[PDB]
Amino acid sequence: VVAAAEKTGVLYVGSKTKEGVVHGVATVAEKTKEQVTNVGGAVVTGVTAVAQKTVEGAGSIAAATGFVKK
Amino acid sequence: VVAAAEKTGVLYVGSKTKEGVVHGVATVAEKTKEQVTNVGGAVVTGVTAVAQKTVEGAGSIAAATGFVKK
Amino acid sequence: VVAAAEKTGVLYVGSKTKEGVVHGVATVAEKTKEQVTNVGGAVVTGVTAVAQKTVEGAGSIAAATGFVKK
Amino acid sequence: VVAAAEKTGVLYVGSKTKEGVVHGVATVAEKTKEQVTNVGGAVVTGVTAVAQKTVEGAGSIAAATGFVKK
Amino acid sequence: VVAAAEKTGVLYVGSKTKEGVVHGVATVAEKTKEQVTNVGGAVVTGVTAVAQKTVEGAGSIAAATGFVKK
Amino acid sequence: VVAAAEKTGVLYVGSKTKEGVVHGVATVAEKTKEQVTNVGGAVVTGVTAVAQKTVEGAGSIAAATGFVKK
Amino acid sequence: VVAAAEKTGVLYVGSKTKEGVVHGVATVAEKTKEQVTNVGGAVVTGVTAVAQKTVEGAGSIAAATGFVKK
Amino acid sequence: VVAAAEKTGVLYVGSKTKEGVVHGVATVAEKTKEQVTNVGGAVVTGVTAVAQKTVEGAGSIAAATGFVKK
Amino acid sequence: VVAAAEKTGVLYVGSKTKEGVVHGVATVAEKTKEQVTNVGGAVVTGVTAVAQKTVEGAGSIAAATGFVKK
Amino acid sequence: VVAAAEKTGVLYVGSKTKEGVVHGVATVAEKTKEQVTNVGGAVVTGVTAVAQKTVEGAGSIAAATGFVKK
Amino acid sequence: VVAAAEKTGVLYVGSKTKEGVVHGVATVAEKTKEQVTNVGGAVVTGVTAVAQKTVEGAGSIAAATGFVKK
Amino acid sequence: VVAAAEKTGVLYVGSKTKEGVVHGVATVAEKTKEQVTNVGGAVVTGVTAVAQKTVEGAGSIAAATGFVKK
């Protein structure tokens, strides 16, 4: 990701990179009702405007696993 | 991520990088109701405007695991 | 992440990096109701405007684990 | 992260880095109600405007674990 | 993180770094009600505008563990 | 983190670093009510505008552990 | 607009009226461009989420009149 | 607008009226550009979330008149 | 606007009125640009979250008149 | 606006009125630019969270008049 | 605006009135730029969280008049 | 505005009135720039958290008039 300029009216050199980006979000919630009953499991709810970048590893967003037995 | 300029009217050289970025979020909540009953498990709720960058490791956002038994 | 300039009207050289960044968030909550009952488990709720950068380690935001038994 | 300039009207050289940064947050809460009942577990709630950078270690924000038994 | 300048009208050389930084936060709370009942567990609530940088160690913000038994 | 300048109108050389910094926070609370009942556990609440830098050690902010038994 | 109840499990009597009401609006604008050149006239633009109730009078929203000559 | 109740488990009597009301609005604007050039006229722009109730009079929102000559 | 109750488990009598009311507004603006050039006229811009009630008079919000000549 | 109660478990009588009221507003502005050039006229800009009640008189919010000549 | 109670477990009688009221406002501004050049006119800018009640008189908020000549 | 109670467990009678009231405001400004050049006119800027009640007179907040000539 390099930018190089050599001069010997306007000169512009640009490199832009976006990875894992969230922008420009508007939400309205009125009179909403939510009930969760969980017995021995996993519940994930209500996830909004989330950004993540991972290098050399697993990347998980809003992941639910009931249980692991070994 | 380098920027180099050599001169021997306006000269601009630029490199920009965004990784795991959240911006520009507006939320309104009115008269919302939420009930959670959890017995021996995991519940995740209401996650907003979260950004994360991870190098050489696992990256988790809003992760629920009921239980682990070994 | 380097910036270099050599001159022998305006010269600008710039490198910018953003990793794990949250900005520009506005929230309004009116007359909201929330009830949590937890028995022997894990509950995570109401997480907003959180940023994290991790190097050579696991990175977790809003993570719930009911219990671990070995 | 270096900046170097050599001259032999305006010369500007700049390097900027942001890692784990939160800025520009406005919140209003009116007449909100929250009840938590916890018996032998873990509850995390109401986390806002939190930034963290970790090197060579695990990084956790808003993490709940019910209990650990060995 | 170095800045170097050599001259043999305006010359500016700059390096800026931000790691684990929170700035620009405004909050208003009116007539809010909060009740917590905890029996043998852990409860964390109401965390705002917190910044942390950790080197060669675990970094935790708003972490709840019900109990540890060995 | 070094700054070096050599001259043989305005010359400026600067290096700035911020790690674990909180600034610019305004909060208003009116007629808020909070009740905590704790029996044999741990409760943490109401944490605002906290900054920490740790080297070669664990860094914890707003951490609750119900109890440890060995 | 009256509500009357007489008792000699649940009894509910209700009258609700809404006149000139706007609610539940979410808008996002990114990279928009707007140019207005006006010479001796009237220009109205960009009107959103406006509510009005008028009794015994004229009610105008987003009204433009170039000029009036008598 | 009256509510009357006479008793000789739950009894509720209610009258609610809303006139000229705006609620629940979320807006995000990023990188918007606006230019206005006005010579001897009237320009109105950028009006959001406005509510008005008028009795025995004219009610105007976002009204532009270039000029009046008598 | 009256409420009357006569008793000779729960009895509730209520009258509520809202006139000219704005509530629950969240806005974010990033990198916006605005230029106004006005010569002998009137310009109104950027009006948000405004409420007004007028009795026996004219009610104007965001009104522009270039000029009046008599 | 009257409330009357006569008793010869819970009895509640209530009258509530709101006229010209603004509440629950959150705004964030970052890197915004505004330029105004005015020659012999009127400019109004940047009006937020304003409430007004007027009896037997004209009520104006964000009103611009270039000039009046008689 | 009267409240009357006569008794011959809990009895509550209440009348509440709000006229021209602003409450619950949070604003953040970062790196904003504003320039005003005015020659013989009127400029009004940056008005926030203003409340007014007027009886038997004109009520003006953020009003600009270039000039008056008689 | 009267409250009257006659008794011949808890009895509460209450009348509350708010006119021209501002409460619960939080503002943060960082690195803002403002320039005003005024020649023979009027400029008003930066008005926040202002409340006013006027009886039998004109009520003005943030009013600018360039000049008056008779």
Coordinates of C-alpha atoms in Angstrom, one line a residue, chain B residues 13-40:
Chain B
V13 CA 0.9 12.1 -1.3
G14 CA -1.3 10.0 1.0
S15 CA -1.8 6.5 2.2
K16 CA -4.8 5.7 4.4
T17 CA -5.8 2.4 6.0
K18 CA -8.8 1.4 8.0
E19 CA -9.1 -2.0 9.6
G20 CA -12.0 -2.9 12.0
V21 CA -13.6 0.5 12.2
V22 CA -17.2 1.6 13.0
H23 CA -18.3 5.2 12.5
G24 CA -21.4 7.3 12.0
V25 CA -24.1 5.5 14.1
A26 CA -27.4 7.0 15.4
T27 CA -29.9 5.0 17.4
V28 CA -33.2 5.8 19.2
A29 CA -35.1 3.4 21.4
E30 CA -38.5 4.3 23.0
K31 CA -40.6 2.2 25.3
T32 CA -38.8 -1.0 24.6
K33 CA -39.2 -4.0 26.9
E34 CA -36.8 -6.8 27.4
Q35 CA -36.9 -9.9 29.7
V36 CA -34.2 -12.5 30.0
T37 CA -34.5 -15.7 32.1
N38 CA -31.4 -17.8 32.1
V39 CA -30.8 -21.1 33.9
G40 CA -27.4 -22.6 33.5

